[PDB]
């Protein structure tokens, strides 16, 4: 991944760089084919090192001053030894080249006086870590290019040129998002290949975000209860950077009371096992420390602490991915391990669990070491000297945060480099607009002068901010004499430490910003695409996001005077839908009608089907032990007479 590093300028004295690139060999040529009026380079500087056992003494020695260890070897047989790096610099100046590009080449000849063009094994890049071109942060991109904007073009080799994507970045910041990958590393691909594509932008932060997903649970007498669980990463807008997920435990029967199923009394004790995976929804991988997690009952009753053995991960935990991989078994809290700590609950705790059917997983931000690029060997490797713990707070202090749920209504967080007005040193950080932030961090695009996220217009999402950011953005709107944020997205300026929360408008949200319902019109409309209906059930085509907010359905026969009979008349029997492989929903009438189709004794009778949303879900008998669906808030989504079915 190596060779030297060249700057090619159109002016005579190195002030207006037009191409920045790296050659694998001593062939420092740029062919005009890889380039407009600006293709005549009047100067050029190359930097790097050379490696080797011998004495040794380019194509334009009358235009080239050169040094090997600030020791001019051109403008002379010098000695060099096996296993040592000699710093190299070459400068070049021709006024008025008649040709475009540069056919330039550097050679040495040995002691068997045999010449050669310097192999790709004797040339190394400068150490671009945190006769001179101005590069204050030593990332490799000249200050002028960072500020004015540049693009990168891939021929064969990356070519960096003044403004494909228009980049800008800070000439004062090795990594403009204060993360562990440099601006130059990101845009030339000298970076860990597991970093998310959008975090190869210098203004989008690369960092892990980890939470724990519980898939299922099993409670038992210390007679058992096994249930599936749904977990969501949460957010409560806030300014906290903690990781947390909430688990909802299936309250519906999976075989013909939790307290009645388990013979608990008072002095009894219950044990808990579960299956989990770690989930990385950030933009950078983790390699050798999984974070530690408290499993919490109620507000702050820690039932367990979940840990994985440091330095013995069986893999990467990559962005947009799971550990273990989904193709592998999940992690058991007490694995098939003598000395797994038992997870225990007293009677009171057990009833509290049954009351709420909820747990919380609080995960710390301890992510361990970083795989950084090494310029000495052009490889990416875990760097024991580099730790995420030192990086995360710098990222958090210099970026605006956008949390967005456009992807399956799951909360996804990105951080974007943005100016801090009070910081005297960030006169140099690129201005970041809200609109550009959504495009680069989340992939919004604008086909027809309308900002969209995968088919959904931006106005289908609501904008919410923390208190400081609200005041800031309100002030901006008035300054713009704008009334409406959607119309001035391109002019809203983002600052460091802003928090912005963007949520699909069709839904209702709990205080964790999980989608837990939708207004009745939304719900009814999502159920109008009926494919088939019969006395055995309904086949519908229902939007994925809609299904996510539904806990179940209630089926009901209504006679001609409107007397109603609820077929699945228990709060724990609403789980009669399933999602077929063609993506359609089947609502099964037989499942709790003793496996029989409905019996409609009169064709004029109605079959009504109601959806129940998450937030309206009853998860226990009432105070007096009522287990019926009486009282449950439900939404009519199908109603037809016997003779229409
Ligand atoms: Ca730079
Ligand atoms: Ca920079």
Cα(439) to ligand 2 centroid in Å equals: 21
Resolved by: X-ray
Taking the centre of ligand 2 as the mean of its atom positions, its distance from the CA of residue 33, in whole angstroms, is 29
Q: Which ligand is nearest to the CA of 7?
A: 1
Say which ligand is closest to the CA of 181: 2
Q: How far is the CA of 418 from the centre of ligand 2 (A)?
A: 13
Please tell me the distance from the alpha carbon of residue 175 to that of residue 528, in angstroms, as a whole number. 51
Are 101 and 29 contacting, i.e. CB atoms less than 8 angstroms apart? yes
Residues with Cβ–ion distance below 5 A, ligand 2: 137, 139, 169, 173, 183
Say how many CA atoms lie within 13 Å of 432 toward its Cβ: 34
Determine the topology of domain 1-206 in CATH.
Toxin - Anthrax Protective Antigen; domain 1 (3.90.182)
The single residue listed with the structure tokens 């409560």 is 236
Give yes or no for a contact between 424 and 172, defined as CB atoms under 8 angstroms apart: no
Any binding-site annotation on 446? Answer: no
Alpha carbon of 8 to ligand 2 centroid (Å): 19
**What is the CA(463)–ligand 2 centre distance, in A?**
31
Domains 1-206 and 207-396 belong to one CATH topology: no
CA of 138 to the centre of ligand 1 (A): 5
Closest-approaching ligand to the CA atom of 429: 2
Cα(208)–Cα(243) distance, integer angstroms? 11
Distance 170 CA to ligand 2 centre (A): 4
Q: Which fold has domain 397-515?
A: Ubiquitin-like (UB roll) (3.10.20)
Give the DSSP H or E segment for 148: helix 143-148
Distance 183 CA to ligand 2 centre (A): 5
Question: Any idea where the domains of the chain sit in the sequence?
Answer: 1-206, 207-396, 397-515, 516-645
Cβ–Cβ under 8 Å, residues 635 and 267: no
Architecture of domain 516-645: Sandwich (2.60)
State how far the Cα of 593 lies from the Cα of 570, in Å rounded to an integer: 12
- Cα–Cα distance between 328 and 323 in angstroms, integer? 9
Name the superfamily (CATH) of residues 207-396: Protective antigen, heptamerisation domain (2.60.120.240)
Q: Which residues pair with 452 in a beta bridge?
A: 445, 457
Buried b (16+ CB within 10 A) or exposed e, 595-628: eeebebeeeebbbbbbbbbbbbbbbbeeeeeeee
Map residue 611 onto helix, strand or coil: strand
569 is in an annotated binding site: no
Question: Distances in Å between the alpha carbon of 103 and those of 35, 43, 90, 96, 318?
Answer: 14, 13, 15, 15, 43
Tokens representing 466?
């923390």
């Amino acid at each position: 991944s190596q060779g030297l590093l060249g700057y090619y300028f159109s002016d005579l004295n190195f002030q207006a760089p037009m191409v920045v690139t790296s050659s694998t060999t001593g062939d420092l040529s740029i062919p005009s084919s890889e380039l407009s009026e600006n293709q005549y380079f009047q100067s050029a500087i190359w930097s790097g090192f050379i490696k080797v056992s011998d004495e040794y003494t380019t194509s334009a020695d009358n235009h080239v001053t050169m040094w090997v260890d600030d020791q001019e070897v051109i403008n002379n047989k010098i000695r060099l030894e096996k296993g040592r790096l000699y710093q190299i610099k070459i400068q070049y100046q021709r006024e008025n080249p008649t040709e475009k590009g540069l056919d330039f080449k550097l050679y040495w000849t040995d002691s068997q006086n045999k010449k050669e063009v310097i192999s790709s094994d004797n040339l190394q890049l400068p150490e671009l870590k945190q006769p001179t071109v101005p590069d204050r942060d030593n990332d490799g991109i000249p200050d002028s290019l960072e500020v004015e904007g540049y693009t990168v073009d891939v021929k064969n080799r990356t070519f960096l040129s003044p403004w494909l994507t228009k980049y800008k970045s800070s000439p004062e910041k090795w990594s403009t998002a204060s993360d562990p990958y440099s601006d130059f590393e990101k845009v030339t691909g000298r970076i860990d290949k597991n970093v998310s594509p959008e975090a190869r932008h210098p203004l989008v932060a690369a960092y892990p975000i980890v939470h724990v997903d519980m898939e299922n649970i099993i409670l038992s007498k210390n007679r058992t209860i096994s249930k599936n669980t749904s977990t969501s990463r949460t957010h409560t807008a806030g300014f906290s950077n903690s990781n947390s997920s909430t688990v909802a435990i299936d309250h519906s029967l999976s075989l013909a009371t939790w307290a009645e199923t388990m013979g608990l009394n008072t002095a009894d004790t219950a044990r808990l096992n579960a299956n989990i995976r770690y989930v990385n929804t950030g933009t950078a991988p983790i390699y050798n420390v999984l974070p530690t997690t408290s499993l919490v009952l109620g507000k702050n009753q820690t039932l367990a602490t979940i840990k994985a053995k440091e330095n013995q991960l069986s893999q990467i935990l990559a962005p947009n991915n799971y550990y273990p991989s989904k193709n592998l078994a999940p992690i058991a809290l007490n694995a098939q391990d003598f000395s797994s700590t038992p997870i225990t609950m007293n009677y009171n705790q057990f009833l509290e669990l049954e009351k709420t059917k909820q747990l919380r997983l609080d995960t710390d931000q301890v992510y361990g070491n970083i795989a950084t690029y090494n310029f000495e060997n052009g490889r990416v490797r875990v760097d024991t000297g580099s730790n995420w713990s030192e990086v995360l707070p710098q990222i958090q202090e210099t970026t605006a945060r956008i949390i967005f749920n456009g992807k399956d209504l799951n909360l996804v967080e990105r951080r974007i480099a943005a100016v801090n007005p009070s910081d005297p040193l960030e006169t140099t950080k690129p201005d970041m607009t809200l609109k550009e932030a959504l495009k680069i961090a989340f992939g919004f695009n604008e086909p027809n002068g309308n900002l969209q996220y995968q088919g959904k217009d931006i106005t289908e999402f609501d904008f919410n901010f923390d208190q400081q950011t609200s005041q800031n953005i309100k002030n901006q709107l008035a300054e713009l004499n704008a009334t409406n944020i959607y119309t001035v997205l391109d002019k809203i300026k983002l600052n460091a430490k802003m928090n912005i929360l963007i949520r699909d408008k069709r839904f209702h949200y709990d205080r964790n910003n999980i989608a837990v319902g939708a207004d009745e019109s939304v719900v009814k409309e999502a159920h109008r695409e009926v494919i088939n209906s019969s006395t055995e059930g309904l086949l519908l085509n229902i939007d994925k996001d809609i299904r996510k907010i539904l806990s179940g359905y209630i089926v009901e026969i209504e006679d001609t005077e409107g007397l109603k009979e609820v077929i699945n008349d228990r709060y724990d029997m609403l789980n009669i839908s399933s999602l077929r492989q063609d993506g359609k929903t089947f609502i099964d009438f037989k499942k709790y009608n003793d496996k029989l189709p409905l019996y409609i004794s009169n064709p004029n009778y109605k079959v009504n089907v109601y959806a129940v949303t998450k937030e309206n879900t009853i998860i226990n008998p009432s105070e007096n032990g009522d287990t019926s669906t009486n009282g449950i808030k439900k939404i009519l989504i199908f109603s037809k007479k016997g003779y229409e079915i």
